[PDB]
Amino acid sequence: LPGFATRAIHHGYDPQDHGGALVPPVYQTATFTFPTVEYGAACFAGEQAGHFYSRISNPTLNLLEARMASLEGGEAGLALASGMGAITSTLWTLLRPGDEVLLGNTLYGHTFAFLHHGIGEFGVKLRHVDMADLQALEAAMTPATRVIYFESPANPNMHMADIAGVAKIARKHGATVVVDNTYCTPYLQRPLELGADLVVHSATKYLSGHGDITAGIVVGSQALVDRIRLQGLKDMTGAVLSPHDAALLMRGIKTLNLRMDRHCANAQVLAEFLARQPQVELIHYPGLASFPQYTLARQQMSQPGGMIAFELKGGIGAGRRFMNALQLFSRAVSLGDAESLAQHPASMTHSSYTPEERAHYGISEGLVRLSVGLEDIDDLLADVQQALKASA
Template sequence: MTDVKGFSTRAIHYAYEPMDNEGALTPPLHLTSTFSFETAEAGSEIFAGDRKGHFYSRISNPTLDLLEKRIASLEGAEAGLALASGMSAITSVLWTLLAPNDEIIVDKTLYGCTFSFLQHGLAKFGVKVTYLDLTNPSNLEESIGPQTRVVYFETPANPNMRIVDIEKCAKLAKKYGAKVVVDNTYSTPYLTRPIELGADIVVHSATKYLGGHGDVVAGLAVGEAETMQQIRLYGMKDMTGGVMSPFNAMLVLRGLKTLTLRMDRHCLNAASIARKLEACGGVSKVWYPGLESFEQRPLAEKQMSGFGGMIAFELEGGLESGRRIMNKLKMIRRAVSLGDTETLIQHPASMTHCTYSPEERLSHGISDGLIRISVGLEDQDDIWSDLNQAIND
């Protein structure tokens, strides 16, 4: 059923026909490491790429293949690639696209492990890493040059919700032949489709909203078919070995079936909680794209069909107030990750973004008092009641 147009329908049906699989409504789970060949000649042809087929699950697997086709369809890309984690997706892509003396331009706010890979990984292998405030596209226009191979950013950014104009950055990058790589974990393809706005590659931590249930670690990347094949055979196969297991692919496929419903509820709950936080005494600032006070609200409306489930806020009293309030929570879980059914709260400076030095956090827009909430699927009143008692008790 590959001709269906609706997003939700494709998330459930795309690239799978039950009657081709003995009527099984749920796609089969192929728990095999290797595949046999009909003949020696057939094996040679598959290895050479002259015939379609699977020969080893580190390269491809039917369960992963279905997930790759489905996420590519949802993102509007030619091809997808399933990987072991979000960081495996990021590193496999960048190891493939970059070489010594190349430059990568990145936004100044990134997930902590991404920052660490760039700052302490790629940089020591001769790749120039340039940090810019990409919320102002003129900064990219002034800095990009012939050695720039990649422009990389998250939007919204983890953890402070900054938004980058994908379309404007993509147009500037294309003038210099640089590829634009966007981490779309916060938005998912349901809310933002960077490929349609000019990006070349999209990466995801599928651990988050795509899986949606906090029971899987997985990554995905999508883009043009030839580039994705290069990443499969070099960045993933040879450089990182970050291969997704078939069982994890099955869990992400399950998650995609309810992505639309869950994201609608995440957005609804987060918008309500953000408004209440903004009106709450003791809260000095709230960052959520759906708030009228959010400085980049017009851009959010332009490239997002909804404002997501993530909120950042700062309390009067800074870090100590944040720790005190987090310790008073009863239902909301103190945990990293995001996109789960449960509401999760964490302190980026001491948790997910601790790989930054204090000076780096300050210059990259991550204050010590910033608190991040991944708003879950519980009843709004219960989420707010827990937050409110912790803040005002």
């Protein structure tokens, strides 16, 4: 009922319950005590029989979880030490040897490495499918298919999946659909509202917004999230989020809407500019009318995002020269920071892939990815302009 910005500030917290504290106190405590051992045993017996209690759990983490659940429109949330923590805790819970996971064609490097060199080496079967192509996806479904996992838009080429289409297919086989919603955040896209079962985030990125914490979030139905908490997190990863970092993340979430509006406004201008430049061969930005999945993008995303990928005609050398000339944009991995960032993976940083896997899946050569920050657009334009000139 209250609006997104209202919920991002207030959801799950009334100051009058914590001595009037306007900002909730930070529970930086590894443990909680009991009034009797009988009461203590009841807390662990509940958890031992699959029930999450909110007594032997941290109220700072609980509040972050409830708030993220509200923003994504899910039943329950789980906070973890990183995006990789969210992903691995989720998949280790849901998969066992002989199960199959159907994967988007393009994934974040460490997700790819986890799948191919981690869980995939313990007898879990993997298959990559184009998640926009529903007839290909339907034909890839097998009785072993238990999870469908993808990012949308897909890092780093912005390929989109048809989330409602995927969910419709999955539902015929009872398969669980997991969407990495890092790029969009719940402010731009809510995959659970389109039929996904679970969403994962690297909250290290836009949710934090300020580049100072590492964190992960899972949001979904109570039964799935409980199992990921009690098995994935507790037993299989130990990817515990610091209450300090959780509190900072909640601080970032309070400006999520305002930050995302600005990331998007800035990236729209840079995309319009780059699409016209002679040095630029191709560009991937969902807000351009020429984006191949323009219509699908606008069905799922309320705004076209803060990320741009493009390719320079001069290939790898031009890519390098462009990167090296940047003075305001920083040369770095990561995204979703106040500071604008750039990376040119042909100076390898989707490096978990071999050269042939990068070619087979959608990762190129003159390809530069920009995380457009919150700086004054006129300064960002000037920096991109002179770097483009230097790329000759």
